[PDB]
Amino acid sequence: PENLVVYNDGADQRAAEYLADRLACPTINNARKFDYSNVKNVYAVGGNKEQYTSYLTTLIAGSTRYTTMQAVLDYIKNLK
Amino acid sequence: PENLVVYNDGADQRAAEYLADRLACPTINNARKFDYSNVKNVYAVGGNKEQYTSYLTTLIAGSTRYTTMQAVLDYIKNLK
Amino acid sequence: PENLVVYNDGADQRAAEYLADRLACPTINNARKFDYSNVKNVYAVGGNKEQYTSYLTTLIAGSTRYTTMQAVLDYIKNLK
Amino acid sequence: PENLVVYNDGADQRAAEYLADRLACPTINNARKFDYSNVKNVYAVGGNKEQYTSYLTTLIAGSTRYTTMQAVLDYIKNLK
């Protein structure tokens, strides 16, 4: 209900756990059927918006697994 | 606010993700400072109760990483 | 060249890391193009044999992610 | 015997798996007692050299989990 990070099976879970560390919050596998309606900030890591809940707040993703990870690190480093 | 699974760095994350799959819920690393007061069911996987929040509901843990995993599988298999 | 554990993206990596702990060996993601010809024992965790190298020695897999994990634990517990 | 990536429990495994993807090779947990003498290139991700085998070839590590990950991405991106 404050922050949640969602990811799909595979390399993107890696990036998601780094984001979850910085935000001090939980992660969730997108394959798990879940009620996102009461989560304040829903972050998605990797892929496209259509894969995720319509309650998504922020998508962090690049062209590859490596650039998705770079995008997360950029996001983490530039938080104020 | 329904279910959350907490784990410590290492092998226990493995067991936690299996439990989170069965419960269709998020996981959280115990190193992340987090407010557990509004979570209905807090599950902890591995270790002892003193490592975790006082809002803990269910600890699933054995003597080793392998028996902790066995305990989680037992828990999953026997849910009705 | 003694032991190697191979897995596919997702839950099966979890089981593979438990097996790799017991065998004190490396793991490899099956998506990585790799030369298996010089590995003495090739273990695969989850799925079917057709997914993996023809140098496969032992497949440990069940009907589900949970029973694949059970099969690995059985294998670990019963080693002499 | 060509490439192997070693890591310690925790966040550094994340970076190690990205490196292993790029190099198409296995990963190994540093807690596993292992014979590194016949591996051509031994990569370590995170921490200091004293934690790892003396057969280590390349250490990729920063001041934090996040900068260790950045260092791996830099390494991956700049390979020719």
Which of B43, B48, B53, B49 shows the shortest CA–CA distance to B20? Answer: B43
Q: In what order do the strands lie in the sheet with C58-60?
A: C58-60, C41-45, C3-7, C27-29, D27-29, D3-7, D41-45, D58-60
3-state secondary structure of C42: strand
Asked if residues A7 and A29 have their Cβ atoms less than 8 Å apart, the reply is: yes
Write out the two tokens for C29: 């993601």
Residue A21 in contact with partner chain D when CB distance is under 8 A: yes
**Alpha-carbon distance C4 to C6, whole Å?**
7
Tell me which architecture the domain covering A1-80 has in CATH.
Answer: 3-Layer(aba) Sandwich (3.40)
Instruction: List the single residue in D17, D20, D29 with the smallest CB-CB distance to C21.
Output: D29
For chain A, state the CA radius of gyration. 11
Write out the two tokens for B62: 């054995």
Task: Indicate the domain borders of chain A.
Answer: 1-80
**Alpha-carbon distance B28 to B19, whole Å?**
12
Q: Do D29 and C20 touch (CB under 8 A)?
A: yes
* Main-chain phi, psi angles of B39, to 5 degrees: -85, 125
Residue A27 in contact with partner chain D when CB distance is under 8 A: no
Residue B10 in contact with partner chain A when CB distance is under 8 A: no
Residue type, C70: Q
Documented resolution in Å: 2.1
Asked if residues B5 and A12 have their Cβ atoms less than 8 Å apart, the reply is: no
Q: Do A21 and B4 touch (CB under 8 A)?
A: no
Instruction: Give Cα separations from D58 to B19, C28, D38 (angstroms).
Output: 37, 20, 16
Instruction: List the single residue in D20, D26, D32 with the smallest CB-CB distance to C24.
Output: D32
